[PDB]
């Protein structure tokens, strides 16, 4: 089990962040593998991938994802200049993160239609400190916990709709939770 922070493990970048609440354990395993076990957590996000990401990576993921409450399983990352937190959401628990958000299009990729949304975070943590910034979402209609994500299809559809990305920072397959419980074991490549 590891400290919240970032680094490399078995050739993969990882990021593990939480709000200090307790109730979440994050572990790095062999190769591109990581696990998360959580029970009455606060907020957290963790997983493995790349630093920096790219705008045409094909990301493969495999494993098991068993949320009990509010959680997402996503390709997750940031850009800088502009600061953007983005998600290609492959599965989630009790809450669809696009609830209440305005739909800005659709994209078909990797066996499913996805719906596209923009939201905004106001004075929230980020890779550069507390900030107000937009979030971009592609939400998969057909939920799954293994597959392949052609990120270019998403980034190109976002750009088409006016959701432009700056310079890529990290890019991971992440489990996120918000005051929930669950378990997950995911392998990235
Ligand atoms: O020490 C600093 C780190 O703590 C910081 O980490 C980032 C903090 O913001 C995190 O993003 C939140 C995660 O939850 C969302 O979905 C929210 O909308 C965000 O506010 C991000 O995951 C962490 O990487 O990075 C900079 C360090 O100085």
Swiss-Prot record:
This is Endo-1,4-beta-xylanase 2. GO terms for molecular function: endo-1,4-beta-xylanase activity. Pathway: Glycan degradation; xylan degradation. Optimum pH is 4.5-5.5. Stable from pH 3.0 to 8.5 at room temperature and from pH 4.0 to 7.5 at 40 degrees Celsius. One of its GO terms (cellular component) is extracellular region. Belongs to the glycosyl hydrolase 11 (cellulase G) family. It catalyses: Endohydrolysis of (1->4)-beta-D-xylosidic linkages in xylans. Its EC number is 3.2.1.8. Substrate binds at residues 72, 76, 87, 121, 125, 135, 170. The chain holds residues 35 to 223 of 223 of the full protein. Glycans are attached at residues 37, 60. Induction: Induced by D-xylose, dependent on the cellulase and xylanase regulator xyr1. Repressed by glucose through negative regulation by the crabon catabolite repressor cre1. It comes from Hypocrea jecorina (strain ATCC 56765 / BCRC 32924 / NRRL 11460 / Rut C-30). Transmembrane segments: none annotated.
């Amino acid at each position: 089990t590891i400290q919240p922070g970032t680094g490399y493990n078995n050739g993969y970048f990882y990021s593990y962040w939480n709000d200090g609440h307790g109730g979440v354990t994050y572990t790095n395993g062999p190769g591109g593998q990581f696990s998360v076990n959580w029970s009455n957590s606060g907020e957290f996000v963790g997983g493995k991938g790349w630093q920096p990401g790219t705008k045409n990576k094909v990301i493969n993921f495999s494993g098991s994802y068993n949320p009990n409450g509010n959680s997402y399983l996503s390709v997750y990352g940031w850009s800088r200049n502009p600061l953007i937190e983005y998600y290609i959401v492959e599965n989630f628990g009790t809450y669809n993160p696009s609830t209440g958000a305005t739909k800005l299009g659709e994209v078909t990729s990797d066996g499913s239609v996805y719906d596209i949304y923009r939201t905004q975070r106001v004075n929230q943590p980020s890779i550069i400190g507390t900030a107000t910034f937009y979030q971009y979402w592609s939400v998969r209609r057909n939920h799954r916990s293994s597959g392949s994500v052609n990120t270019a299809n998403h980034f190109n559809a976002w750009a088409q709709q006016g959701l432009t990305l700056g310079t890529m920072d990290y890019q991971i397959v992440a489990v996120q939770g918000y005051f929930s419980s669950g378990s997950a074991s995911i392998t990235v490549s």
